[PDB]
Short mmCIF file of C-alpha atoms and ligand atoms in Angstrom, two decimals:
data_model
loop_
_atom_site.label_atom_id
_atom_site.label_comp_id
_atom_site.label_asym_id
_atom_site.label_seq_id
_atom_site.Cartn_x
_atom_site.Cartn_y
_atom_site.Cartn_z
CA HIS A 1 34.93 133.69 -150.07
CA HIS A 2 33.63 131.77 -146.93
CA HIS A 3 30.42 133.20 -145.18
CA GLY A 4 30.70 136.25 -142.89
CA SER A 5 34.50 136.16 -142.49
CA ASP A 6 36.47 138.94 -140.71
CA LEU A 7 38.16 139.70 -144.05
CA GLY A 8 34.75 140.57 -145.61
CA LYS A 9 33.90 142.54 -142.42
CA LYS A 10 37.18 144.53 -142.84
CA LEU A 11 36.25 145.34 -146.49
CA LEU A 12 32.68 146.44 -145.38
CA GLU A 13 34.29 148.76 -142.81
CA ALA A 14 36.95 150.20 -145.21
CA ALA A 15 34.24 150.72 -147.94
CA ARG A 16 31.99 152.65 -145.46
CA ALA A 17 34.97 154.71 -144.25
CA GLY A 18 36.07 155.49 -147.84
CA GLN A 19 39.60 154.00 -147.29
CA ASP A 20 40.59 153.60 -150.99
CA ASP A 21 44.09 152.07 -150.32
CA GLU A 22 42.75 149.68 -147.68
CA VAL A 23 39.93 148.59 -150.07
CA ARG A 24 42.47 147.76 -152.86
CA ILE A 25 44.76 145.89 -150.32
CA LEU A 26 41.85 143.78 -148.94
CA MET A 27 40.59 142.88 -152.43
CA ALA A 28 44.13 141.79 -153.53
CA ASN A 29 44.14 139.54 -150.35
CA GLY A 30 40.98 137.81 -151.63
CA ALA A 31 38.18 139.72 -149.73
CA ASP A 32 34.73 138.96 -151.11
CA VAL A 33 33.26 142.08 -152.91
CA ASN A 34 29.79 140.70 -152.09
CA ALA A 35 30.36 140.13 -148.33
CA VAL A 36 27.24 140.78 -146.24
CA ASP A 37 26.87 141.87 -142.64
CA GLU A 38 24.01 141.04 -140.21
CA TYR A 39 21.80 143.76 -141.87
CA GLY A 40 22.38 142.27 -145.33
CA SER A 41 24.53 145.31 -146.28
CA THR A 42 27.26 144.79 -148.89
CA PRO A 43 30.45 146.97 -149.38
CA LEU A 44 28.64 148.60 -152.37
CA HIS A 45 25.62 149.54 -150.09
CA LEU A 46 27.99 151.13 -147.51
CA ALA A 47 30.17 153.01 -150.06
CA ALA A 48 26.93 154.36 -151.79
CA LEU A 49 25.37 155.43 -148.41
CA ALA A 50 28.54 157.24 -147.18
CA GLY A 51 29.09 158.84 -150.62
CA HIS A 52 32.48 157.33 -151.67
CA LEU A 53 32.34 157.50 -155.48
CA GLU A 54 35.91 156.10 -156.10
CA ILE A 55 35.24 152.97 -153.94
CA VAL A 56 31.77 152.47 -155.60
CA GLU A 57 33.69 152.35 -158.97
CA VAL A 58 36.40 149.82 -157.91
CA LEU A 59 33.73 147.56 -156.28
CA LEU A 60 31.74 147.54 -159.57
CA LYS A 61 34.93 146.98 -161.66
CA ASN A 62 35.61 143.85 -159.49
CA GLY A 63 32.12 142.33 -159.89
CA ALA A 64 30.11 143.72 -156.94
CA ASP A 65 26.38 142.93 -157.22
CA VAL A 66 24.76 146.27 -158.27
CA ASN A 67 21.32 144.91 -157.28
CA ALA A 68 22.06 143.33 -153.89
CA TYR A 69 19.13 143.70 -151.41
CA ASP A 70 19.63 144.14 -147.70
CA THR A 71 17.21 142.86 -144.95
CA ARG A 72 14.92 145.94 -145.51
CA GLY A 73 15.02 145.31 -149.29
CA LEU A 74 17.18 148.42 -149.88
CA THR A 75 19.52 148.31 -152.84
CA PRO A 76 22.66 150.53 -153.22
CA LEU A 77 20.56 152.77 -155.60
CA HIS A 78 17.87 153.27 -152.84
CA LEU A 79 20.73 154.37 -150.50
CA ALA A 80 22.49 156.71 -152.97
CA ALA A 81 19.01 158.40 -153.62
CA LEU A 82 18.14 158.51 -149.85
CA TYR A 83 21.55 160.02 -148.86
CA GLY A 84 21.52 162.54 -151.77
CA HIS A 85 24.61 161.26 -153.73
CA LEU A 86 23.85 162.26 -157.34
CA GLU A 87 27.17 161.07 -159.01
CA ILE A 88 26.88 157.65 -157.31
CA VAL A 89 23.17 157.49 -158.48
CA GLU A 90 24.42 158.11 -162.10
CA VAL A 91 27.31 155.53 -161.85
CA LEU A 92 24.99 152.82 -160.42
CA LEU A 93 22.42 153.26 -163.28
CA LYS A 94 25.24 153.03 -165.88
CA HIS A 95 26.23 149.62 -164.36
CA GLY A 96 22.71 148.17 -164.63
CA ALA A 97 21.13 149.18 -161.30
CA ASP A 98 17.42 148.36 -161.29
CA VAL A 99 15.74 151.83 -161.37
CA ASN A 100 12.46 150.26 -160.03
CA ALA A 101 13.77 148.01 -157.20
CA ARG A 102 11.30 147.80 -154.29
CA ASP A 103 12.19 147.78 -150.63
CA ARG A 104 10.03 146.07 -147.90
CA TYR A 105 7.55 149.04 -147.96
CA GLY A 106 7.21 148.90 -151.77
CA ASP A 107 9.22 152.13 -152.12
CA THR A 108 11.42 152.56 -155.16
CA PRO A 109 14.54 154.88 -155.30
CA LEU A 110 12.15 157.51 -156.88
CA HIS A 111 9.91 157.46 -153.73
CA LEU A 112 12.97 157.94 -151.41
CA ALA A 113 14.54 160.78 -153.50
CA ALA A 114 11.09 162.56 -153.70
CA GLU A 115 10.60 162.22 -149.87
CA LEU A 116 14.01 163.87 -149.28
CA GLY A 117 13.39 166.61 -151.89
CA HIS A 118 16.40 165.56 -154.09
CA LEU A 119 15.26 167.21 -157.36
CA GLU A 120 18.21 166.38 -159.68
CA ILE A 121 18.34 162.71 -158.44
CA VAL A 122 14.52 162.51 -159.22
CA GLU A 123 15.17 163.95 -162.74
CA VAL A 124 18.05 161.40 -163.41
CA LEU A 125 15.90 158.46 -162.16
CA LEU A 126 12.97 159.55 -164.44
CA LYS A 127 15.16 159.68 -167.53
CA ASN A 128 16.48 156.15 -166.69
CA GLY A 129 12.94 154.70 -166.76
CA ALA A 130 11.69 155.27 -163.17
CA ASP A 131 8.04 154.17 -162.91
CA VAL A 132 5.86 157.21 -162.03
CA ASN A 133 2.83 154.90 -161.26
CA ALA A 134 4.69 152.64 -158.79
CA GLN A 135 2.71 152.63 -155.54
CA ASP A 136 4.27 151.76 -152.21
CA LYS A 137 2.45 149.80 -149.43
CA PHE A 138 0.75 153.03 -148.22
CA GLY A 139 -0.70 153.44 -151.76
CA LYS A 140 1.63 156.36 -152.62
CA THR A 141 3.49 157.22 -155.81
CA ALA A 142 6.56 159.58 -155.80
CA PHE A 143 4.08 162.29 -157.16
CA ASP A 144 1.71 161.69 -154.14
CA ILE A 145 4.72 162.20 -151.78
CA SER A 146 5.72 165.52 -153.50
CA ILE A 147 2.04 166.79 -153.24
CA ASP A 148 1.70 165.69 -149.56
CA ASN A 149 4.95 167.61 -148.78
CA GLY A 150 3.77 170.65 -150.78
CA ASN A 151 6.91 170.53 -153.02
CA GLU A 152 5.40 171.95 -156.21
CA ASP A 153 8.86 172.27 -157.85
CA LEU A 154 9.38 168.51 -157.44
CA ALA A 155 5.74 167.71 -158.38
CA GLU A 156 6.24 169.66 -161.68
CA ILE A 157 9.44 167.60 -162.48
CA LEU A 158 7.47 164.37 -161.68
CA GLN A 159 4.55 165.31 -164.07
CA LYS A 160 6.56 166.77 -166.95
CA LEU A 161 9.99 165.06 -167.06
CL1 CL P 201 27.88 161.39 -155.30
#
């Protein structure tokens, strides 16, 4: 629907604020599920960041792009991992999220979850095919990040799971 309309902007705002009723109302009025703001963020990026599981589900049910990339190359999965939202991480993977998507720095969701010490998110990403050898632009793997941060608990999950 159009290109950067105020209707799409209202849906982006309601998705970030977790306004479930307002999100259903706006969608019924024809708001585009894949509306983008100036940062290339979609309603699914903003709901995943702010940890609104229910809204993430309705967006997906109504055809939101699970692998949309913003201006920094961050996908909704990168954001759910970075903000520590485990249930959203699981729901996104079930709806075909690309476990090895790369942002502008070559970091995958695994790199971001390791950097923030999110152990269970790391474990879930590994069992969904996360690439342990993926190197970012600084030449680091998620394992290298865990070692540099002296998180031996995380490093052990990264080597054995
Ligand atoms: Cl969650």
